[PDB]
């Protein structure tokens, strides 16, 4: 479809210029390639939902960008040379195998003269690789967020910073992969990826997308039952609300209200301020609590963690200053090394649930002072030196 | 139609009619089998609303009935067998025809010429019907194996057939025909294969050593594998002692086939394959010896003399000597009704500085020991373990190669450099020793196997000679239930005394310049006859002791457990066996006491 | 050729049968539209993906067709006997009539008959042991029952591969099997054949036939395990609709046709052909006069003590602990909170002391008697022994979460030995599973959180060597209170030698072995069978608490925390009698009541629970 579309498009551009007679000096531009990057296509249910029934279809996705491979070159066009004469002829990959001629071009001859493959001379597409952590929301449970990976391609490459919350659409895709790495064997059990059509170059376009008004802001982005909103603003009037809420907070837990309260504030915490630049005290509030054990002191962390969308619950000593950040593990799926956000970078946003704080490794929590103060984190370590915000 | 019936075959079958008609005993036996199947068939259908087809045949009949069919099958099982099995399947069809398989035979016997053991085998025995006995290892892990092929053919409908003759098929071999997998019928119509029509059979093949007991003085063992399938499969565990009826196959090309040494992989098929019982020597006591025992049994002091008979070379340790004796004896064995068995045997352990002859003695142990294997430190692999021999060996049935203890079941395991051995093993040892059994889930064959072997072990002082003054513990160096597990723990010391030394060196020199033969003889009969049972006479003494033991000793030293008690039990029972007494006696108690004391102190 | 690949006539006739199929199909009666027709349009409306067949309505179709003739050919006896053909052929019979195999879009499943339909009277389903499984049932449709391990992550498996000549056009449909394949090239197109030049074909993913299989291995229910040996495991085939329904640590009745797939061991190891086989999965299923059998126990009364004794009479002494083990086995009643949150619900028992007691011997006992009990030791059962690995399973497909220990024995007790030696990761998990119903593995290919319903029994030896009395409690005890907090019942068993009793025990041990039977003059121990029965009957009760018992409970509890803290510093201890102490006791009496079968929850049951409590510890004073 999109192919036909592009064709019609060029043809139309032409027919338009012709109306204009001389256009843009002159006919070269028509020969140039225009391409469709359709977006906004369908309401797709997550990923995990999808059936093999749809292997190839436009699909909508969302959520922050986990990790992204560097550009990986792709010769559409391989590059070959001959031992004789030499002739430089080169074959385009097309289908994913490169079938090289045994012999030979110039001489030809014959001669069963080695046809050399100049790897520095071959074409490269990057079509980059983005580990995607998808949030469909609408979580059916009991599922835990799937991670995705999409090949992008072309101009799309690198247009995305990691962590962006983006809307992109693309083609569902599935591929087998060879198991032995020696033998020709392929794994059956195909492995699925996304082809990555349009994102939401679109990068260059940016708010030119917002033109046409950008879809009435998704019709308010599904704001509450307006009536529900009224209920909210209504309950606000409840004078007890400050208390009543704290009650509603922990149904199971008894008494200890001021706790429930301070927490409630932790849910409402503060307001972010960028100053002119910097500023950025955010709203952050770090509450600690101790006492006699079995306080339910656990139970609460349970509750919050349950509530908290981005929160994470961790145990003292089940921990050290590293697991909170930057695993930088070998991807090993590609047999690659891959930067893995440790616990904290993930926890950026929402709250963090810390068991056995008093018991944390001294190495650990050295982390904290950075976090607590900075509210961000600077890892100069290993291959990449950076200060990430959590 | 095949190659058409041969009056060879025809007369073979026909000839085998009168037998089995006489002796008719089988004629109804099959009917019994059918009956059983029928009844079970009604149980499945009506209630919620099985047996094998082989029937044994005593070879005794043939000699009377047919000497030439006797002789013929024995010699030419190839010829005689198949037609016979045919006759059987036919009569079977006759018995109950109406409602709607090999119908094999065991071939009991009345063996044999043709009675030979795995040591003495072939080349004349090659391809004759044979009966060999011995231990079961390396066993196998069965694989189901397929049979006859079936194919649907559209649009022609119809059906196809196919068969497959294994190298193990029949017994005596044949010119092999590869049939591969039938498909794409000619004319070119494809063939849709169908299962559940196509028959299959489970498959298994195990190895059989020559009888360890009957083994020669010393030498390399010579074992032979046999294939067992379906019904025959799985009947026995590795380490079982058994006698197998099966033909000797030469199967396979011996290298003359591919033109470009060894030859002709040979194996035994099935067949009857009976599990047999053996103790837990050989020997021959005649009249005189048994008498000699009998008279000697009366001698009151005999036990000490015995205790002396062991150590021609060794001074002292008569306590220990006595100990070993008791090990040889071992407190009978008790398997409670519908309940776990009481361990009769005792595990022994010795500790001291080297030159203790600890190494040396163990040899002497092995000598008159009547079996069993010896093990030194590491040692392994698996010790007693089957290793679950992978893969198969043969046919696809993955072998279980019975290890030391299994093989040493019924027998004396020597553990040398016991300290050296890996805790990895030790974990198992806990099971083997106490639990008295071994269990294997590995991949794999899921079975628990029984090694009943008794245990002795010698291990160095923790470090250096420091054992002597060292604390009762940490002198140990191999906690713990280890320590508990050995029924006996012996601390020997190398500390010097000049008087003692002279006493030694005299003996020493003399060496350079009650006959043990009679020993093991005295042993075996004592072993099989007879169990002392137990007597309330002692029981008091024992409890008295034990309470004294936990009581004062836990202050003095440790550990004292119910284990201690049981050990006492086995101890007494053995001492009665030494006494030959069909009963337990309070004197024997006093002895076991003395010894246990010595162990403690 | 004839005389090669012979033909053999069989009573089986498919021609008439297929007709019979079309007859029963959608032309059916018992269930205005006939069930299969309507269902068939619901699929034809595109709404319904898979089609579940049931043989009972076939039984009814036949009794309709038997009587009420003409006599019609028996499908069932033929189906279960083959059924493999029956799948594909049935499929064709259907494909015609709707409101080729390449375009089907629907899955066909069958449901076996047990049943009351067996009782008609009318086998196909006899839930079986893998032991009970013989290699002669290959191709038969069979129903069995066993423990789900493995239980794999569905992966698309392709059936046939479509290439297109694009020169000769047409298509190239290559069916595919096992793990791997080599893609076809040139063109097999009959038009590209015999031409001087064959077309070149490249596959098209939209065309090909793919499937998501889902894999599992199943283990013997282990009650079925023969006295010896060990419980066996089995692989199973599942694809399409049936996928995802499976989870480890599941006890399910599965119904599927048992099908072989060729494999063997080391090449030097195979005579041929074996099969190595497989199993395929069509369908999965996860107080009359017996009250007399209970009543034998009941009428005698003193069932709490009687049974108490009746547990592992094999050992002399410690009736208290045994009595505890009783309730341990009983459990109850849990609760759910209204939102709701649940509260176990179960007992957590610690057994202290060393070396002897053969303390383990008890554990052996329980694990023996208790259905769904599992005996384990520290070094011992690996952490991944308790945890589940995601590992592919056979026949069906793929990446199966194979659980152990807890998952394996859940809803039933789990027994731990050398509890000191279990190290740390173990300790963590357990510390967690004290949340009950909770195990969670985030590692790698596992995001899942399993629910473990097991109960926990903990046997450990005191800090070396044994219980230094000079060592305080928790001194002589190596473990963290955090876990100890979880442990409901810590039975600390210490040994001070005593002339008199040691006589008694000594006698017991002499009498048995001397007798196989220890109890005499007079104790009737309870057959763990009928015992287990009575247990089943009690487990149904779910008692309710008196306000009074509630009150006394409270007061006492105050007294309990109060004295416990009044103890203050060390010795003695462990404090503090945390609420969990309370809650625990609540569950405890809740159990004692259930021994009465209750619903009353009388204050005596409580006071008992107390006596027991005070009894558990304080043994330190002797």
Short mmCIF file of N, CA and C in Angstrom, two decimals, chain C residues 167-170 187-199:
data_model
loop_
_atom_site.label_atom_id
_atom_site.label_comp_id
_atom_site.label_asym_id
_atom_site.label_seq_id
_atom_site.Cartn_x
_atom_site.Cartn_y
_atom_site.Cartn_z
N UNK C 167 8.03 -15.83 -11.41
CA UNK C 167 8.22 -16.10 -12.82
C UNK C 167 7.14 -17.07 -13.28
N UNK C 168 7.13 -18.25 -12.70
CA UNK C 168 6.00 -19.15 -12.88
C UNK C 168 4.83 -18.76 -12.00
N UNK C 169 4.97 -17.71 -11.19
CA UNK C 169 3.93 -17.34 -10.27
C UNK C 169 3.73 -18.45 -9.27
N UNK C 170 2.51 -18.96 -9.20
CA UNK C 170 2.16 -20.11 -8.38
C UNK C 170 2.55 -19.83 -6.93
N UNK C 187 12.87 -22.97 -8.62
CA UNK C 187 11.43 -23.09 -8.51
C UNK C 187 11.05 -24.53 -8.73
N UNK C 188 10.24 -25.05 -7.82
CA UNK C 188 9.59 -26.33 -8.03
C UNK C 188 8.31 -26.18 -8.82
N UNK C 189 7.97 -24.95 -9.21
CA UNK C 189 6.75 -24.72 -9.96
C UNK C 189 6.71 -25.65 -11.15
N UNK C 190 5.60 -26.38 -11.28
CA UNK C 190 5.45 -27.31 -12.38
C UNK C 190 5.68 -26.62 -13.71
N UNK C 191 5.40 -25.31 -13.78
CA UNK C 191 5.72 -24.52 -14.95
C UNK C 191 7.19 -24.16 -15.04
N UNK C 192 7.83 -23.88 -13.90
CA UNK C 192 9.27 -23.67 -13.88
C UNK C 192 10.03 -24.98 -14.00
N UNK C 193 9.34 -26.11 -13.92
CA UNK C 193 9.96 -27.40 -14.20
C UNK C 193 10.07 -27.61 -15.70
N UNK C 194 11.13 -28.31 -16.11
CA UNK C 194 11.34 -28.75 -17.49
C UNK C 194 11.54 -27.57 -18.43
N UNK C 195 11.22 -26.37 -17.95
CA UNK C 195 11.65 -25.20 -18.66
C UNK C 195 13.17 -25.16 -18.65
N UNK C 196 13.73 -24.55 -19.69
CA UNK C 196 15.16 -24.31 -19.68
C UNK C 196 15.56 -23.48 -18.47
N UNK C 197 14.66 -22.60 -18.02
CA UNK C 197 14.92 -21.67 -16.93
C UNK C 197 13.80 -21.79 -15.90
N UNK C 198 14.15 -22.20 -14.69
CA UNK C 198 13.19 -22.23 -13.59
C UNK C 198 13.12 -20.86 -12.91
N UNK C 199 11.91 -20.46 -12.51
CA UNK C 199 11.75 -19.23 -11.78
C UNK C 199 12.49 -19.26 -10.45
#
